[PDB]
Design a protein around this ligand. Structure first.
Ligand SMILES: *[C@@H]1O[C@H](CO)[C@@H](O[C@H]2O[C@H](CO)[C@@H](O)[C@H](O)[C@H]2O)[C@H](O)[C@H]1O
Ligand SMILES: *[C@@H]1O[C@H](CO)[C@@H](O[C@H]2O[C@H](CO)[C@@H](O)[C@H](O)[C@H]2O)[C@H](O)[C@H]1O
Lengths: 514, 511
């Protein structure tokens, strides 16, 4: 009460920092980029080595791209399935440790400066298949865990649909499921039973391969956790038309009576538009079963990652809808998204989640309110900070605490590449704001700025830590060829980055991110 | 409804920046520091020139120290009164424009590289007195405004008390009001009436001089507003014992039956400030009216106001008045948010800055955040300890005022010069530093680059001055509060400094 003495412990009653507010940093590196002899990175020794190296820097976050099966061009964003793992990430050496292969079966190593997906498939698939076959034919512990995995309801609600879809796709020569014969197209029960009988082996193998992915990924994830590293994933808001996700859940999407999309995704114009062409969600239909499809999707995301970015988060508040009949995106309209009620349903369904909102480009007031109402951080990207004036939200003095700052993403050139093509004027702006030593180390200047931010989380692509140029760019949007291929040079091992590790640690130390 | 079309105006529905969140910057400069011929800066031409210069830089905040009558050492923090203005800031030239003096009456100029208060008083007081006398003897517009000022209830609730207190203090030879004879000490009504009769002239002149201060300060304030400059003031949480504030409001303080403080202020290690303390429960019973009036006066003087030792609203150190050292005290519970609720109901929206430096407790932070008041960061304190130091830029908050230093710190150049090596190498890593000559611009730049919404720089640092321009050194009794802009440096002569500031404000979005 007012005017009275405090207890003797008043002087010691200091403010304690909230542990959920802890400043941190991390590295963006997709596992396909790891070194190794089999044409593609994988979840074996290089993953653990990278985790050790990451830990040694003081970083506590590892961000990956979606771990789904990619398209033939390698893209993790136009995947074949929203919940399955990319089986080409499976490590053959780890299969040997599991007793599912022997050393003499391993293929001769190949040089692959960049990932060629066709080549990695030819090399690895037969062996993964053979391992899966031995797993299914065995009795004993590993087989017993396959069964737990298979009969786990949170797995089976997506895994059986995915396996049947893949069995049918394998059996049929057809562009997409729109062209399937009606009983398969529309999942007649006795058609599905007939598929299980006739493609039983394929289905059991597919399931086995997903188990093996899951097992290897969970080991990487538990090892990260033991080293104090959280794993941050990514998911596109939309899924592709030719997938189990759509085919097994037609009523949750905006399709006509024949299963063809009424409306597809995109954004309006600086252009004639941009037509992505994904089917759109039927959000009122989803509302009627408490958003169960999205709840399951997040449950799988939780299973894979500690935290997850959602690409095109703005779509939850309002989305651009183009007539499927159209060739340009400029003919669409904006539709009302589900807003917070979706996230309420997810919370009741799954508990606490950690979502990052990709909120780049021009966005509307409702996007910002939705993001803030669920407490999700947005993004800042230093590479975008030097156009326009001092109100540019990517400039450090405009950063927020509840935010993730990047030097650049997988969609941007490396900092060195970006610097090299930077327009004079943007460059002189940058020179004033950044602390730049030699232009060779331009990537460290940007890294330092990212770390000096008030944003709680700073993420740096591995390409920038390695100071690489444009040829190490992961993706160039709106190109159909030559993306997703980057690998750590075969020369650079995690034993050979002590200087880089020290330099990062010193910066994290200085800006309070350790 | 979910899935339905938005109106056609969706694409244009962009986020608007909130105007209350606008990033800005300003300069700390007390008006006594202005150049001029009369021994001290004043509210005349130099104030308006400075405002013009400030506007030309892009700054939109001018912070002053308390404008109260100071003690004999010049200190605005151990003032004679919490609500009166320092009459020595009154401009003689502005009195000539008001027709209360003529040019021929103005004194010969004197050299005063620093403010000598005794010298400014000898020079200016007779003229201010004479002006006040002509004002009271006149019958026109100006006289009519004096009367409105005098009879305005929001003025008279402090001004009459202050005038009588000063009249008695002038009439009596006594250390403090504790030694006054009982009827004066305890404000017997017929004693006060006797004072009005016998000191009528002194009282009317005192009131007239406060009117003239008010008039000149309000003109400076309006001129600032017209040039897009808000004025930020300061007030110590506590007032001095020998003041009208205590004497006319005894029940609101922790005094014994004889009017001697039971407990006085300070902080532990000790430091004994020795001010009387508030009787917060007694204040509670008239809805904190004393504090409400105080804030009303602060609103009248400033757009925004810092409160020195804000932590005292949540918990305060209380020393027995008996004592010579502060280490034997105890912590007592402050009024918290209920005070600020009362202020809001009384006065409406306020803009308060919490001085929250040093070691502070969890309740201090919660109170500050619950009323939405910004705290402080001071770059000069940022390089001791580790990376969790709250004064480092990466730990700043938006709702915060960042300083390079305050009036209690050395200039950046002076500070740099005495900085110990481990702290100095730390600074070199965080700051962008060129030559030691421009060390103050390195710190200014860091301040401006902060996420803090408001950045304030002492004029000494803009001028790149050393330790001799330090305004105050705490716990010293002599040589403080004297700094003046060198007579050579005019606001016409700071184009380079203006440009350099504008460029930095432009870059960090504070224009
Ligand atoms: C955000 O999502 C988009 C998907 O629309 C990704 O875009 C990449 O992938 C698509 C599909 O493979 C491709 O057509 C684009 O050219 C490519 O940029 C982004 O990478 C994600 O960050
Ligand atoms: C905060 O308030 C204190 C008052 O306790 C000021 O301290 C200065 O003034 C006092 C009173 O004249 C003097 O004793 C100190 O030595 C001096 O530091 C600060 O200046 C204010 O910021």
């Amino acid at each position: 009460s007012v005017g009275e003495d405090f207890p003797s412990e008043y002087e010691q009653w200091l403010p304690v920092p909230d542990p959920e507010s802890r400043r941190r940093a991390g590295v963006l590196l997709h596992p396909t980029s790891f070194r190794g002899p089999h044409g593609i990175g994988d979840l074996g020794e290089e993953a653990f080595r990278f985790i050790d190296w990451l830990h040694s820097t003081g970083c506590s976050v590892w961000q990956v791209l979606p771990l789904v099966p990619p398209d033939e061009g390698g893209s993790p964003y136009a995947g074949q399935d929203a919940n399955c793992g990319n089986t080409l990430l499976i490590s053959l050496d780890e299969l040997v440790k599991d007793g599912l292969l022997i050393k003499d079966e391993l293929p001769q190593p190949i040089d692959a400066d960049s990932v060629n997906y066709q080549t990695a498939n030819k090399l690895k698939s037969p062996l993964i298949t053979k391992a899966a076959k031995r797993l299914i034919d065995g009795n004993g512990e590993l087989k017993s865990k396959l069964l737990d995995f298979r009969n786990d309801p949170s797995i089976s609600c997506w895994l059986e649909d995915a396996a049947y879809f893949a069995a049918i796709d394998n059996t049929l020569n057809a562009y997409s499921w729109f062209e399937w014969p009606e009983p398969l197209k529309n999942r007649h029960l006795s058609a599905l039973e007939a598929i299980y009988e006739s493609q039983k082996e394929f289905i059991d193998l597919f399931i086995a391969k997903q188990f093996l992915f899951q097992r290897q990924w969970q080991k990487v994830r538990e090892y990260a956790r033991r080293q104090g590293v959280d794993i941050m994933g990514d998911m596109p808001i939309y899924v592709g038309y030719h997938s189990a996700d759509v085919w097994a859940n037609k009523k949750h999407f905006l399709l006509n009576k024949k299963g063809f999309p009424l409306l597809v995704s995109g954004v309006p114009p600086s252009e004639t538009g941009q037509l992505w062409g994904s089917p759109l969600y039927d959000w009122k239909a989803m509302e009627s079963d408490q958003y169960s499809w999205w709840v399951n999707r997040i449950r799988r995301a939780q299973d894979l990652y500690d935290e997850c970015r959602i690409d095109h988060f703005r779509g939850f508040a309002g989305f651009w809808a183009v007539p499927s009949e159209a060739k340009v995106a400029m003919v669409g309209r904006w539709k009302v998204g589900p807003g917070k009620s979706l996230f309420d349903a997810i919370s009741k369904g799954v508990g606490k989640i950690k979502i990052i909102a990709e909120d780049l480009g021009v966005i509307t007031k409702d996007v910002v309110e939705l993001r803030k109402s669920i407490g999700a951080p947005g993004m800042a990207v230093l590479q975008f900070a030097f156009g326009g004036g001092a109100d540019n939200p990517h400039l450090p003095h405009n950063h927020e605490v509840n935010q993730v700052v990047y030097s650049g993403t997988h969609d941007n050139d490396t900092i060195r590449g970006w610097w090299d093509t930077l327009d004079q004027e943007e460059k002189s702006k940058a020179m004033k704001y950044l602390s730049i030593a030699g232009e060779d180390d331009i990537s460290w200047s940007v890294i330092q700025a990212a770390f000096s931010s008030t944003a709680q989380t700073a993420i740096i692509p591995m390409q920038d830590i390695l100071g690489l140029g444009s040829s190490a760019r992961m993706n160039t949007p709106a190109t159909e060829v030559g993306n997703w291929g980057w690998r750590i040079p075969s020369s650079t091992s995690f034993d050979n980055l002590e200087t880089e590790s020290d330099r990062l640690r010193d910066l994290l130390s200085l800006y309070g991110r350790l």
